Amino acid sequence: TFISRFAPDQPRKGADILVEALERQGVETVFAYPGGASMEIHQALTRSSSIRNVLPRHEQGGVFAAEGYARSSGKPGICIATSGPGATNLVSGLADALLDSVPLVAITGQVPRRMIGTDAFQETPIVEVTRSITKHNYLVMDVEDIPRIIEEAFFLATSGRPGPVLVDVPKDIQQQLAIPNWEQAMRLPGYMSRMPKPPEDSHLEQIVRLISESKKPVLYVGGGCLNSSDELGRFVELTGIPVASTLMGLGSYPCDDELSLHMLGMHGTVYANYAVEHSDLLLAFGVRFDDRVTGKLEAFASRAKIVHIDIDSAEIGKNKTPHVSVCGDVKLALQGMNKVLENRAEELKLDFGVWRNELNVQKQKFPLSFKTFGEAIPPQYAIKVLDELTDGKAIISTGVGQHQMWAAQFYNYKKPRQWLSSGGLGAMGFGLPAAIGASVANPDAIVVDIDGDGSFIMNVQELATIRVENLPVKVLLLNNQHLGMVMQWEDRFYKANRAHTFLGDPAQEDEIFPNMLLFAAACGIPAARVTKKADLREAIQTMLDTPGPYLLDVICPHQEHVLPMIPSGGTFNDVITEGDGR
Amino acid sequence: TFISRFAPDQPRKGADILVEALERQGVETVFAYPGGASMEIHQALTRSSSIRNVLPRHEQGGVFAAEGYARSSGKPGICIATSGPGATNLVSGLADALLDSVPLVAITGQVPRRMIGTDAFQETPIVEVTRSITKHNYLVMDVEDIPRIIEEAFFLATSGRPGPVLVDVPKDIQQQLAIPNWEQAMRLPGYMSRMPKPPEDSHLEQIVRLISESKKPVLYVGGGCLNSSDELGRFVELTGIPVASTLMGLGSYPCDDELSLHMLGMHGTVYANYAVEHSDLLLAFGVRFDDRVTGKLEAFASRAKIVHIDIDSAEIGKNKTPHVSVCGDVKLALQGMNKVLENRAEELKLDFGVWRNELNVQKQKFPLSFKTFGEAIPPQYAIKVLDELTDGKAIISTGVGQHQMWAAQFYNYKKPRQWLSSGGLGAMGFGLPAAIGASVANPDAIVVDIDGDGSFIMNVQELATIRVENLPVKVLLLNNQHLGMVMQWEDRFYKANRAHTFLGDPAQEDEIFPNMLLFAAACGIPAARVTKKADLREAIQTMLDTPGPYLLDVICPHQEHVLPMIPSGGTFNDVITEGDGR
Amino acid sequence: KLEAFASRAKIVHIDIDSAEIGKNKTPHVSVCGDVKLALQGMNKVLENRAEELKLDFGVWRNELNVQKQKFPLSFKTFGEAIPPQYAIKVLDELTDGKAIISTGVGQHQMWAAQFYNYKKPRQWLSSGGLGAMGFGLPAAIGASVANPDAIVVDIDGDGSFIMNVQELATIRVENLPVKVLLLNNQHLGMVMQWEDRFYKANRAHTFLGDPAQEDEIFPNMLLFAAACGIPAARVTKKADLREAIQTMLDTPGPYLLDVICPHQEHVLPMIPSGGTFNDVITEGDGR
Ligand SMILES: Cc1cc2nc3c(=O)[nH]c(=O)nc-3n(C[C@H](O)[C@H](O)[C@H](O)COP(=O)(O)OP(=O)(O)OC[C@H]3O[C@@H](n4cnc5c(N)ncnc54)[C@H](O)[C@@H]3O)c2cc1C
Ligand SMILES: Cc1cc2nc3c(=O)[nH]c(=O)nc-3n(C[C@H](O)[C@H](O)[C@H](O)COP(=O)(O)OP(=O)(O)OC[C@H]3O[C@@H](n4cnc5c(N)ncnc54)[C@H](O)[C@@H]3O)c2cc1C
Ligand SMILES: COc1cnc(OC)n2nc(NS(=O)(=O)c3c(OCC(F)F)cccc3C(F)(F)F)nc12
């Protein structure tokens, strides 16, 4: 039973109705940056005793923090911005959350209703702008619609395939006095009618039948499995089927487990990609068959019967036509299959030991590898040390680039929602704000942002947010003085012709630039730089043991390349396993 | 006669066609940040010997720098970004350029054509997203359309009412080989048919007639006059009509001149707003009657005959119905009127000396004022000192907030395009990147970013750009540890109830946070902090005299309020002339 | 009701539009491609493994034949009044089921679909998804131009026919041998039927005749045809129906046959909107 700060017969501002609407949704944390059009909302926020605001230093920081909050908790992330320049600063985050299917509710202030469409002060047609990059959005046109729209926004953001919903609120609506009705019905008849029913037995038994008739089965798991760890784990025990994971699915199945093939795809392991290439049964759970994984579609799992379980019917049969499919929650599908597999266990007698041994040979022949040059720090090694010292239990957020791939390759995530990374949109500047949100959502957790120098500086202003909010965010900065991933493609495909990928100062090219230590010092955050591999272990240990925020600048040779690599639109036979920029 | 790096019969990449297309438009500088979808374009850029790239550290920095480049030169600003997160980072800048009518061409890389609309890697429907916040945009669907589209983009961006044009270029188009045709006709029959004809004599004589019959005429000039300084100056000599300017029009008429009423509007001078209030003739040249200027429309110039000259017919009669209007270039209208006024000078005998004296009384009674508390630095004073030491000849860019208004109030701009400020959208983070573009466009000019602490930190990463590019950008940081303008409205209208407007660290609230000096030190930029008014003069002098970039952290009491202030939607009788947060 | 539709079946869906596969119902097996090619592929397999598969659904087929015998398509004959269902059956017989048939929308459309045995595809031309009245006569025009040697008949309703009656002029001028079998019930029949079943027969603007002369056929469609120089006739008695249709077919060039039908007829069977097989209505009319 919810307790309002207002009397049931007492009129109050629309802004106070909106904040209470958030409280009734169970919101405990928002990331709000004030402005003229959203002042009333911020005033109402101070009157709330249950909602905490984390003030960012940039609204892109705000929305990325809401993302990190969401990805690390499974709860909706909430960001708030003013009209115009505030709203437009959210755009990258909205698109990011849509492509990665992250539950997010964004609230934007708007100019008074009568002035909409008149090029007014700080006016942006944000509903128009963000229509194609949100799951849904709203323009609130009456104070009385606030309770319903807020309820629908949270419902849409969190149900089905999760995604961002934006709610645009005119200033005069925030100022209008009214008595809210909290017991109004949502108006989503179309959406509700298309919500998948629980998986039917006929389809699940079809899958179990294929499993018993296969000899080379492979699990292909992704972001859709993040809430299905126990079920998936149970499924693997009952079948003995090896697990290949997408970038978004890392940790759904324990990466340190023997049955784990780790990540597949463009920079996936040789043995994971091998498994899919030679499989006769592909169990695609919570994945969307993106070309970063599949490469050339006709060659992808070309000899396999494909099972696809997705909660979004639009994804099933999009890029590849499955032999068997289930449109529904993979969590429920796993539960259903686990019961069948258990009851018929002594009848099925599942044993893919020969297939598994074939894959273990591939693990031995072509494991993840890196080269150590003198006392220079291998970025791959730095992440391995982090894994060891944190016992693989840390929450890891990243930027985008080489360091992102290495963070995905050389850290064995034991649970889902440890791994926070922009996959679909691949937005630089994501790491630090996402770590902020994750730390607020998980106050007792070890939170580390494994960032690149290009990515880190993009939202470096959020260091101020970290200090002021006293968040124990660790920054493991893999510093190669380059836009590394672009540099790598220049090396492989453009004869190493540099086109604006160097991030240092050419007038002093053998000096580390900028000095990231001083960025941290500016915000009262303790920091250090390590250059020799021998000192790396103690340096990381110091970062972890030092209470509160900490920045470790890890200097790395820039000639490193991410391996293996399947070229764009290529096949498994095109995989590159050696070479760098030396 | 243009000289290509390719033979007329030699096929070459679409990316090389695009870069040459820019060269043929006379482009000398671009602000490009590389990514996968735009790699080919960046490779082609290195093959150009005439185009310089300034690599930003954030694409918002890139587009804001292109804006500063444009606003300070009158040339189109050119920014380039990759697909997805690169493109979405341009959005605030695009909207900003549209609202302030700034000529800008933005080029974005895009996923291969066949993959458009499939939620591909780093894909954003950027043409959809930016349709309502650009003057026009394009999705290039064939390599052969590149020369025409680039020509149309520059034409549309610079002709009529200037604005941003975005061109989206799929990667496969950049890679396609072709032989370009540079002599193809533009396809803009509708736009060209609506281009205003040169002002007719009948309309200009109508205006001169009203001037000779008026006794209290006031000039109301804005951004549309930025290329009409000589003509407007000549016009004022021939008529003796006092000049009131918008935020966007500052410097069109010399602010230090006796006939200058400086800025009108919400934070305009009392005497400027007085003039408009009691005028019987309002000469609105290159303005759009925005409510920041007009307040309550029915009360604005309520007793005046209104003359409106605008190049955009959609602006004429929008918010206020003029008695006389000219749809055309105000530059040409001024030239036409100046000839008439000169030939009939001894016949007209124009003399508004009585009106001017009435306004001078208002200047004496209610001038721009500020209060000095002990040895604390008045932000208003700091700008006045800057004015004196630079002889009012510096290029000034700003952020948004109190410091922006003071930079507009207490600096006497002698020429147009000295003043670079986000007016319509009012985007924080604009100042530093805009100064970057202005410095590149004007290498010999004194360029100063008058920034707020909230605004400055938003794009603080561009300090790296400044050092690497060796730009002599000066930063005058007015530091009040607050989101000042929001704080002011909290004081006036919300009983000083703070709602997330403090930018320092509450755990050490009497320490300056962050330490902006260390942000500068991180990027090898010399810096200093001044706290006492007595030291302020030498500190600013040191900033100016020190070669290269420099940051001056000016500590200001936060209780300062911007005055005068006409409340939102208010009238001249509602003007606030005293009070602060003390 | 989807949940009840084929509720105990494994579903195979072959469609050339991937957006259709898994839209309303999730198939156990699917093929996204040309069904023509899928059939060719399966036919080769079925032929090569014929003696191995030994397919025989004779028991199932017999179960369905019992249903054919118990519940066939049926209609009732009242005195000498013309059953619209019968009129279409006679047309089927006299054209040997080889005619191109276009229709309007309504009761006559359903009867044209129920009581004519189409032997080949593209004989049946009817607006299904949108269900647009006025489609029949112009569609017959296009079909006749495309198929100059074919028997083309527009089985139309009086409401549907008058909507694009102006195309009679097109038919004469272009000299198209378009036959019009007009099933005339003086009503918007299908709407009238739903009024009877679900609104206690409360008429809401479904009568198309003249209330000032309600037992006169209005309008006189014969004169519409005469206006465009098209020979026409009206038949009212079931006994005269056979010769009348024969005359329409044997008369060279365009021809209009106005077939007067009792309006109380209902299209049967009927499964109510969003209903199940257990809800099927097999008897009743507007009498
Ligand atoms: C530089 C870079 C390199 C990359 N290289 C790789 C690589 O080598 N390998 C790789 O894997 N990725 C790589 N990516 C990431 C890639 O672009 C995609 O982000 C990712 O591969 C897609 O993840 P996904 O297939 O699991 O689908 P997701 O984006 O995680 O979407 C989840 C899918 O499951 C469905 N779903 C959601 N919830 C449920 C549920 N409860 N039940 C059933 N279904 C559900 C959703 O509808 C959706 O279809 C890279 C990214 C970058 C930036
Ligand atoms: C915090 C803040 C406070 C502000 N307060 C004020 C204030 O007190 N006073 C104030 O003035 N502004 C203020 N503004 C700015 C305000 O929001 C607008 O940006 C500005 O007032 C509008 O400028 P403008 O009227 O000159 O039109 P512009 O935006 O500069 O547009 C130019 C107009 O002239 C036309 N034009 C362009 N070229 C030509 C040509 N060659 N010939 C003829 N016509 C042409 C265009 O079509 C357009 O209509 C403030 C902004 C902020 C962020
Ligand atoms: C320079 O104008 C503002 C400066 N600082 C502000 O908050 C710290 N505000 N807040 C407002 N609100 S507003 O005046 O009612 C208004 C506005 O005024 C319309 C009024 F007629 F109601 C028009 C467009 C936008 C806004 C906005 F978004 F800023 F709210 N205007 C300013």
Ligand SMILES: COc1cnc(OC)n2nc(NS(=O)(=O)c3c(OCC(F)F)cccc3C(F)(F)F)nc12
């Ligand atoms: C992880 O993928 C990339 C990493 N780094 C890159 O440049 C440094 N690129 N560049 C690409 N180009 S791409 O592979 O042809 C491609 C792409 O591949 C389609 C291919 F089948 F042609 C699909 C969507 C976007 C892109 C993009 F935008 F990145 F170009 N992909 C990557």
Ligand SMILES: C/C(NCc1cnc(C)nc1N)=C(/S)CCOP(=O)([O-])OP(=O)([O-])O
């Ligand atoms: C430029 C670019 N990608 C294009 C790009 C541009 N801009 C944004 C906002 N996002 C992306 N992904 C990368 S991955 C460079 C990353 O450099 P880094 O942050 O230092 O990481 P690393 O050097 O390890 O590759």
Ligand SMILES: C/C(NCc1cnc(C)nc1N)=C(/S)CCOP(=O)([O-])OP(=O)([O-])O
């Ligand atoms: C929050 C805000 N405005 C809302 C806002 C939010 N976000 C953006 C990107 N732009 C704007 N205009 C202002 S003006 C605060 C400015 O603080 P400041 O940069 O330190 O300048 P000052 O303190 O002088 O007002």
Ligand SMILES: C/C(NCc1cnc(C)nc1N)=C(/S)CCOP(=O)([O-])OP(=O)([O-])O
């Ligand atoms: C009004 C209506 N349907 C709604 C309607 C309205 N308007 C158009 C253009 N199309 C349709 N389908 C029908 S089916 C009445 C048909 O009357 P009819 O042409 O004489 O055929 P019949 O009486 O056999 O049902």
Ligand SMILES: [K+]
């Ligand atoms: K930033």
Ligand SMILES: [Mg+2]
């Ligand atoms: Mg790097």
Ligand SMILES: [Mg+2]
């Ligand atoms: Mg401030």
Ligand SMILES: [Mg+2]
């Ligand atoms: Mg009828």
